[PDB]
Design a protein around this ligand. Structure first.
Ligand SMILES: [Zn+2]
Lengths: 139, 82, 19, 66, 141, 134, 99
RNA sequence: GGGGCAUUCGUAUUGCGCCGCUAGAGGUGAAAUUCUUGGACCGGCGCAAGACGGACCAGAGCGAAAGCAUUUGCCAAGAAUGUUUUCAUUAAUCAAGAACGAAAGUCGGAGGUUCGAAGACGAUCAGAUACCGUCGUAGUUCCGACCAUAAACGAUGCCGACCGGCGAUGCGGCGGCGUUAUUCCCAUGACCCGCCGGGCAGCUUCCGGGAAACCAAAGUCUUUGGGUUCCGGGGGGAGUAUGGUUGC
């Protein structure tokens, strides 16, 4: 029997390609965060501006400051929400993509977002391995 | 086209047309008096204002500097003068 | 011939003349 | 482009038909306010046959461009 | 258009026809003069003084109420600055750009813009020397 | 080989690298490290013209399926791959024929995905400034 | 004589646009001029979709798509027959062909 | 996506170490040169190097023009708008004289991933000194000196006035129903309908020009004068000769 642990979270190609449209601003924010139990993650979160339901205008672009504010907002949300808790909880947070939903809700006021997913999560550094916690992760 | 009285344009068309490109020049700005909620003393302010102004009566901010017209603080009621 | 190659021939001729 | 002469008769009959009541004679004519404003400025403000329906609440008519 | 820019910007002040003092103005010519002096002592520019007096105290135009301009009032008393406002401001912008350039040898844009500022100093200096408000030996360094 | 119930499908990962010069059908385990079997158009046809032909691709996928049956693997996760990098992103002509041939052999189809190496701001492409004049 | 008012490109009120590489023959072409063809094609053609449906372990499994943006130089755009010459009057028409 | 300096990230490419299976792999219209059982190509994990910032990316923005897209910070600029602020003719255009100026190119240093003039081969060819393919020096990249040219183009000098409509678009301002988020009231965003000024443009028009192609400027030209700079005089000879001056 083989014992596995979380190493990273990737998004499938066809989804990532189907999201990028030709008349809207794409916003990308990466952040390095240290978990409490001591795993160093690099989290890349991507967002897209929303075509409003009664919008006649062809383009739905956001101005540079509005983009910078949204980037700061989704950076500090990611930081706060993955700084305080550990892998056990962080994975469970990433299963429904609750990070994204919270960014979509939070960034509504600055400019309406369409699809905000946690694009990538990469394990940068590991702790010194012990069997006890790995077995606890399995039971 | 071809018949307009350049002499006597209609007052709604006069107001719409740019302040400098009017038949006779007049500013779009005006002078208004402010009534602060926590004070009795009256103050006069410019509609497009550039400095945060203070009422020395109660020592409170009145209007904020903006790209165009100065936004007045909540409670302070503005009224047009002449 | 092509005007750019007329100019290049003229420069090759000016190099050998001066030397 | 075939002048048969037969169907020209029933075509002339179809081109010389009138209904017993006039199509223009509605019971109550439903009119927008600014038209009632336009009428009352020509001294037609006493008309009680015209009913003024409330004007549309949302402002959007143009085709979505793009 | 502009002096050293391709833009044809049409944005200035449009003073009204009625030169008449507004009925609601309580402050008298002397009272405004006293206000201008009190402001001038705090170390301000005719521009700033005029803005402060327009915003706060509700004086539409100093020259309408008093019958004389700000620099003229300060000149008449002797609370006027040595260099004129506009030249002083061009010099402090010039030395600010020069202070930036002293560290950054690669910033060609800064060099080009400095040359354009220097030109404005020299063209304004020549005018002030022509009107004899500066001495004729006055140079820039 | 694997001691598994008749009902449950043992999965593998099939990497299909479809270039314009050749086709690669390569079956491996779930991880990718422990390969099972790779066959390319070169092994099927002895013609440099037809290395990439849909027929060669069909034969390659048919033979790799035939071998995979004998090792106990019933299902495959497909990973389609074009040359990518600074070169073309569209898959070669063998891809579809190979996938059809795997699906026809009786092997089950898992998650289908493109794994073309897409580059963000890559280095100079093999062609000159004026490009390929043929 | 002036053939196209826009000089057969999009750069207006702008100095220099970065060059890109023609997907076919790798020619260096300015991005604004290049013929761009964004093709969203199904990973399996309708003829071969039937054989995948039964073989698939999953029920109602929506099939993936390939998104690839092709850039063509004028030499290759015309040879590949994605774009051809038009009449002097029908050139000014810049409406894309209806399908 | 104006400029400089600092910082950080992205996949890809190439080389290297380890692991699995293996007989072909590369390239082309077709081939060969070439790398391969001393284990290539393919697949997995990790390390390193230098290059470049995809898709978003538009007849969109900014800049005097060259030109300018990863994040964050620092430094100093700049247009436009807003103004019942100030100076009061300080202006326009420019011999001489200045700043900048793609790519290539020449000196010194650093580093060399990809691509690749020269050159070496393999093909095609009557011949190929080329097109096609394998390799590869200088170069391509960075720091400090030069060089001052491009179809450096809108093949269209700059400043100012007047002369037709139409719908978009970018920045700022102004006014106004109604949707939505910040719980709610205002107040800010995202939309929506108008207006005003300055920009990138587009469509239409017997305003009027032009040899026409076309141009709302290339119009207001024999009904010929708003201001001012550079500059052409049939085609070759020729941007040649000589002289001067700048540069290694
Ligand atoms: Zn091409």
């Amino acid at each position: 029997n083989c014992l596995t642990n979380f190493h990273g979270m990737d998004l499938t190609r066809d989804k990532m390609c189907s999201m990028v449209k030709k008349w809207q601003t794409m916003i990308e924010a990466h952040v390095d965060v240290k978990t409490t139990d001591g795993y160093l993650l690099r989290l890349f979160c991507v967002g897209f501006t929303k075509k409003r339901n009664n919008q006649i205008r062809k383009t739905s672009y956001a101005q540079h400051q509005q983009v910078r504010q949204i980037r700061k907002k989704m950076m500090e949300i990611m930081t706060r929400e993955v700084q305080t808790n550990d892998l056990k909880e962080v994975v469970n947070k990433l299963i429904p993509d609750s990070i994204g939903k919270d960014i979509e809700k939070a960034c509504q006021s600055i400019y309406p977002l369409h699809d905000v997913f946690v694009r990538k999560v990469k394990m940068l550094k590991k702790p010194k391995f012990e069997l006890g916690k790995l077995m606890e992760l399995h039971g | 086209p071809l018949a307009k009285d350049l002499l006597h344009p209609s007052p709604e068309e006069e107001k719409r047309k740019h302040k400098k490109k009017r038949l006779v020049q007049s500013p779009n700005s005006y002078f208004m008096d402010v009534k602060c909620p926590g004070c009795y003393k009256i103050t006069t302010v410019f509609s497009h204002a550039q400095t945060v102004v203070l009422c020395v009566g109660c020592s409170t901010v009145l209007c904020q500097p903006t790209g165009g017209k100065a936004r007045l603080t909540e409670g302070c009621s503005f009224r047009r003068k002449q | 011939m092509r005007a750019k190659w007329r100019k290049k021939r003229m420069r090759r001729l000016k190099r050998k003349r001066r030397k | 482009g075939i002048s048969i002469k037969l169907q020209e008769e029933e075509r002339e009959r179809r081109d010389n038909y009138v209904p017993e009541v006039s199509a223009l004679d509605q019971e109550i004519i439903e009119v927008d306010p600014d038209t009632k404003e336009m009428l009352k400025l020509l001294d037609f403000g006493s008309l009680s046959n015209l009913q003024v329906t409330q004007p549309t609440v949302g402002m959007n008519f143009k085709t979505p461009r793009g | 258009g502009r002096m050293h820019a391709p833009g044809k910007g049409l944005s200035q002040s449009a003073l009204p026809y009625r030169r008449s003092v507004p009925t609601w103005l309580k402050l008298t010519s002397d009272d405004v003069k006293e206000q201008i002096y009190k402001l001038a002592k705090k170390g301000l520019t005719p521009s700033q003084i005029g803005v402060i007096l327009r915003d706060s105290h509700g004086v539409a135009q100093v020259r309408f109420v008093t019958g004389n301009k700000i620099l003229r009032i300060l000149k008449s008393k002797g609370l006027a600055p040595d260099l004129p406002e506009d030249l002083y401001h061009l010099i402090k912008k010039a030395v600010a750009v020069r202070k930036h350039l002293e560290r950054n040898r690669k910033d060609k844009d800064a060099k080009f813009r400095l040359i354009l500022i220097e030109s404005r100093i020299h063209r304004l200096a020549r005018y002030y020397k022509t009107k004899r408000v500066l001495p004729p030996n006055w140079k820039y360094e | 080989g694997p001691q598994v119930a008749e009902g449950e499908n043992v999965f593998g990962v099939c990497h299909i690298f479809a270039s314009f010069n050749d086709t690669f059908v390569h079956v491996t385990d779930l991880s990718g490290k422990e390969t099972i079997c790779r066959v390319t158009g070169g092994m099927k046809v002895k013609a440099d013209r037809d290395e990439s032909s849909p027929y060669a691709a069909m034969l390659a996928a048919q033979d790799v399926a035939q071998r995979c049956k004998e090792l106990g693997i019933t299902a495959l996760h497909i990973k389609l791959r074009a040359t990518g990098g600074n070169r073309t992103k569209t898959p070669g002509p063998g891809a579809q024929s190979a996938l059809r041939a795997l699906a026809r052999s009786g092997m089950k189809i898992g998650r289908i995905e493109d794994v073309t190496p897409i580059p963000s701001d890559s280095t100079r492409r093999k062609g000159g400034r004026r490009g390929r004049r043929l | 004589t002036k053939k196209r008012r826009n000089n057969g490109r999009a750069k207006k009120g702008r100095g220099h646009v970065q060059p890109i590489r023609c997907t076919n023959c790798a020619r260096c072409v300015p991005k604004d001029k290049a013929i761009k063809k964004f093709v969203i094609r199904n990973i399996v053609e309708a003829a071969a979709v039937r054989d995948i449906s039964e073989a698939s372990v999953f029920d109602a499994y929506v099939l993936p798509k390939l998104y690839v943006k092709l850039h063509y130089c004028v030499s290759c755009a015309i040879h590949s027959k994605v774009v051809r010459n038009r009449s002097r009057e029908a050139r000014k028409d810049r409406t894309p062909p209806p399908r």
